[PDB]
Each structure stands twice: as structure tokens, then as C-alpha cells.
Design a protein around this nucleic acid. Sequence first.
DNA 1: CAAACACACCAAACACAAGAGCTAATTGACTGGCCGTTATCGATGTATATATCTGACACGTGCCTGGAGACTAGGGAGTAATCCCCTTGGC
Length: 50
Amino acid sequence: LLQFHVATMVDNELPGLPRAMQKSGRPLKSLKQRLKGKEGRVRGNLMGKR
DNA sequence: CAAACACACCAAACACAAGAGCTAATTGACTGGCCGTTATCGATGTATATATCTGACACGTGCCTGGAGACTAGGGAGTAATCCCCTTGGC
């Protein structure tokens, strides 16, 4: 369980493994998701800003 | 026979899917155990309201004692005459 929780903390989406879901019923935004691609940190707030 | 590499095939993942710009609306956790506050139910009264019994005062009835009424019996109190004892009066 500890391994699963940490992996979900730094990577929500895994191949085949269950996805961490908030009790409300929505997935948790792991750090990888935070800067995986567009709308992230690099392309979202370093190469393109407001 | 066992080990080296090469090839074809199968099986498993990664990341991307233009630049953005505006507006709207759906989601606003939930049973249970337990502690902590507080509302309620309960006992243990003392204070006040009412009922029963006892005591003092009031009106009324009564038993008892003494007093009062009508009538009676028969004798106590009491006129009318008399005597003469004795008192007042006198020189």
C-alpha cells in the first residue's frame, strides 16, 4: 500500500494498475501530471505565460 | 553438446494529436462510537392549599332547683265592753 500511494503521489497514471481516485470521485493530479505536457509547468508557465 | 550472435516474431509501453479567445452551469459527504453540554426524568424536600379533628365562642335546648299560684283548713290576730288597779293630781 505504501508503494502504491507513493507511486500515485508522483505518478497517478500507471499501466494497468488502479488509478488513485479522490473520495468525491475524481482522479488525483500527481506531480508528473502537473508538468507532463501542455498546461503543465514547462509549456504552461515557462515557455508560455500570461 | 553447449555457447556466441543474428533474424523474425510476439508482447509490452510512451507520447503526441494548432494558437488560442469568450461565455455558461453541477458538484456545496456520510453512519457510527464516543465525550462533552445541556434537556429531561426522578427523589427529597419545604412552602402553600385544602381536609380532619380539637378548642373557644355563640345560639339554642334542657334537667334540675327553687319559686310561684289557687285553694283549703282552722286558728292567730283583732272589735266592742267591762272592771278596778293605779296613776296623776291636789293641799
